[model samples]
Every structure is written in C-alpha cells, then in structure tokens.
Target chain A: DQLTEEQIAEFKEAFSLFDKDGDGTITTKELGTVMRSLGQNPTEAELQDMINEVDADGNGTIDFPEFLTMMARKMKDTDSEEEIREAFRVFDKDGNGYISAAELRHVMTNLGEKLTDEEVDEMIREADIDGDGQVNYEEFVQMMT
Target chain B: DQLTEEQIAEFKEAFSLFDKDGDGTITTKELGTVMRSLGQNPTEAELQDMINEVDADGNGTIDFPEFLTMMARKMKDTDSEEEIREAFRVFDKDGNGYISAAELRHVMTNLGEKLTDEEVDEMIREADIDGDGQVNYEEFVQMMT
Candidate 1:
C-alpha cells in the first residue's frame, strides 16, 4: 500500500543507468542507445516522443519523477492475471501450452538480454515449481505474481 | 509458461473493443477515445506514433499481435518488485507509510475511474489482508502481484 525504501533505491539505480550524464535527466539519444542495447530499436523521433509523452512538464527531458511516473504507469496497468497470461504467451511461442528452454532463450535473445544457456536452464528451474524441467501455465503464473 | 484459455479470451475481448470496425485493426482516434475513457489523454499524434511504433509492419494501425505486443511490453518491463513499490507511491501521496481510504479514493479519482466511497472500502477490503481496515506495505505488495 505504500512505497518501500528498497523499491525507490531500485528505481534510483535504473534511473542512474539512463542519467549517465549525472545531470539527473535522460535524453533521447541516451535512451535510444540504452533501449537498443536491450534489443529494442527505436528511431530518434520515437524516442523523443517517449520522453515528452511521459515528461509531464514538457521541458523536453526525462527527470527522475518523470521516469518514475512512466514506470508506475506500466505497473498500474499490466499486472492482471490476464496480462500475466499474455506475458506467458511471449515465451510459449509454439502455443504448446508450456515454455521450453529453447523458447525462453529465443525470446530473451530477441528481447535484448543475452543470458547464458546455463542461466536459461537455471531460470527455468527457479520457476519450474513442479520439477517438470519446463514451465506450464500454473507455474508461470505463480512465478510471475 | 503457457497461456490460459480464459486469458486468450480476455485479449480477444480487448481486441474487439479496439477493432470496432470489424477490420481486424485499430486506428489512432479509436484507441485515443477508448484510452481517454480509461483516464489517459494521449494526443492524436502520440496515438498515431504509438500505432506505427508497435504496428510491426508499417501498417499505420494496430493489429491483434501488435496490440498484444504492446500489452506484453508493459507486463514485462513494469513487473519488478521495485516497480510495484513505485505503484504504491502513486496512492500514498503524502509519502506516509500506509494507504488510507481517502488516499485510495483520491488516487483512483485522478487515475481513471470514479468509484463510490462504499466501493473504495470494498476495494480496500479485497486487499487488506490483515483486516486492519487499511492497507500496509506487505499487504499492498501481495495484493499487487
């Protein structure tokens, strides 16, 4: 029901990643490069719109508050059970009703992170709750929420 | 993890709402008005850009996959424990350690929908795990995820 100290600290770290200038703000190019590294490729114009769209004050750059607001919007709208189910779909691409290691790695590679093969297996184990070595809908939902 | 049958059905409903013309696609104005009712005020240009940005085929409009992708993006990026903590702040306006009925009502009032005072209490009860009549951080986090 309230903000936690650690949670705020986490945002601080993510914000610092964006605010490399130490100026407490993030620019379009900066965000673009960062997102690109994470497997997203937004045009300069698209990045600009992203910043101003959530900038709130329209000063043309994203400050900590603005960035946090942007983040909060995502948290607010996307945590329903239905939303989690959709997220599961992203990994269960084959519609086979389960998430395999190959599917996980494929999705992660496209989504910007390059986890090691060992890590992918380890990730599955973490959420494999049923010891099935692969993730099912129930396990995935449990892991998500 | 795999998606639930009901979950896919939920997306179908959302897609239908966006694809009001039965054209299997959603346009800027359509999305704009729908989102507006949900308490967001995205500009037409912003809305247009959103479509093209995630349209995935330069279609200038959103199709089912594109919409699902956008929704999935939100679910993925905004789901860290830290992110839920930030959402708690959105309602804890005074930066207090807990959320009150008034605070919840106020936050909901600004965020999107209009809820009755009675309903706010009901909402609180749904998540007030400890039955203390107010929401605390631990309970809040559990309720969120």
Candidate 2:
C-alpha cells in the first residue's frame, strides 16, 4: 500500500475534491456530493454509515481532523501506516512542504487522465486554505496529516 | 460470487499465466513463475503465503478454477464486485465473450502503462479454453465464476 510519489499526488487531488466549504473540513454533505460526482451513488443510509465511521463526537458531519483520520484508517485498512506515510511524502513532493493542485495534476497526468483547469480549480476551491482561494502548504499538510 | 460468461473471460485473462504445463492445473512453480513475471520478486515464503491462501487442499498446486478464484478475490479487495464486473464489461466492449491480448493491451495503455508480448501471450494462454490457444465465453466464465 506504500504508494509511489506519483500515486500520492494523484490521491491528494482526489481527496481535495471531497473537502468542501473551503474551511479545511469535509462535512457529510460535502463528502456525499463528492461521492456522487464520482458516480458512487451512495444512498442516504450509506452516507450515514460513512459519517458514523468518520464523525467524531457523533456530530453527523466530518470535520477536517475526522476526515484525515478516516483517510488514514482507510489507507491502513488497505495498507500499512508506513505505506500511507510514504504516500503522504509523495504528495508532499519537491519536499516543498505542501501539495498543490498543480502538483497533483502533474502526478495524475502521469498516472492516467490529465486534470482540466476546471477540475483543478474546483478541487482548489474545495480545499482552499483560510478561504483564500488557494491551498497553501500548511493547509495541504494539515489535510493529509 | 457468480459470474457471467464475459466476466469469466476477463478474469481468466487476468490470471491465465498460472496455468503452467498446459495441463489445466497450476503448480507452485508455475504460480511462482507468474508472480515473478509480474515483477513481484516474491520470496519463496511469500509465494507460499499466496499458495496457502488459494490452495485449499494443501495440494501444493492450484487448478485453473482455484487460481481464478484467487484472482477474483484480489480484484475484489480494491473494488466492489460490481466495479469488477463493469471493468470486465468495459474491456469486452466488442461483446466477443473473451478478450484477446490486444484488448488487454488497450486497457493497459489506458492505465498509462505497457505490457510485453510475452506477458500478454502468457495471460492469453492462461485464459484460453479447450486448449485451443484462445479464450471463449465458457472458459472465460469458468475462470471468473
């Protein structure tokens, strides 16, 4: 499950799309939207199930920390934590301290389909730090960590 | 899980290389060979780990059916059964019942990777039915089912 740097970058792009509200957090509704966009067609019950697993304090919504923990758990279910950390490092490519949609697109284009500007912009808006219209290194690291 | 003819075909192609000796059964050596060919570089212990997971009878070998089941399980780990089915259907776009090496090559290309001719042929040979050096609907179905 230890992903290559390229795979990590691609995953960051995909992950960002789920973090809506530009508040570095992902609510259940936002996650649902992202899942629907991916054609998962998860039902309300399914969404609830996901939330139960991700929502700390039983708030019925996933905050930023909850989302990151769930992501780590999911990755651990599929791979080891060491592997997950390895993937995170890849997303943090250039060791430049954080991941950007551009870096993610670079990795994704290598893996498969290239990211369109709309896709990148949409992901950025969803993952923007401080609601500043951009994903800074800190926000990016916090999301993954 | 039950499988349609097309699904069986696709699964067969995905794991045909384990069928060594052309005797319709896959020996441990054959399984090891297939893993090596896939660039796994598994140690003997690792190879045995896989064998133990699939070789129900402690027979030290796997028949085509057992190998197919193992492949199906592996595919299931990363995706839902429906997704695996859809993948098969997508690859069998021509409704030819079985996918040739060329078709598999196309799928690989879409993944932004390439497979060598030997690898492709080995895959085809592993999936082929009636020992006719080609896979048919029944053979493919048997593999996946």
lDDT of 2 by residue, B1-145 (tens): 6556865674454345445356656666666554333322236886687778767686877666766666556444443333223223332324543322222222223112323334334334545332211223233223222
**Top candidate, metric TM-score:** 2
Per-residue C-alpha lDDT of model 1 across residues A1-145, encoded as one tens digit per residue:
4446764664555455435468888665555533322223345676677786866575667777766565455345433343323333333333554432212211222111223323322333354222111123233223334
Give the TM-score comparing model 1 with the true structure, all chains together: 0.25
The TM-scores of chain A alone, one per candidate, are 0.39, 0.41
lDDT of 2 by residue, A1-145 (tens): 5546764444444446545544565656566554433223357897787788776466656665655555455554452223222222333324543332222222222212233334333434534333211223332223322
Best by lDDT: 2
| A85 Cα displacement, candidate 2 (Å) | 24
For model 2, name the residue pairs that clash.
Answer: B8-B140, B8-B141, B9-B140, B16-B126
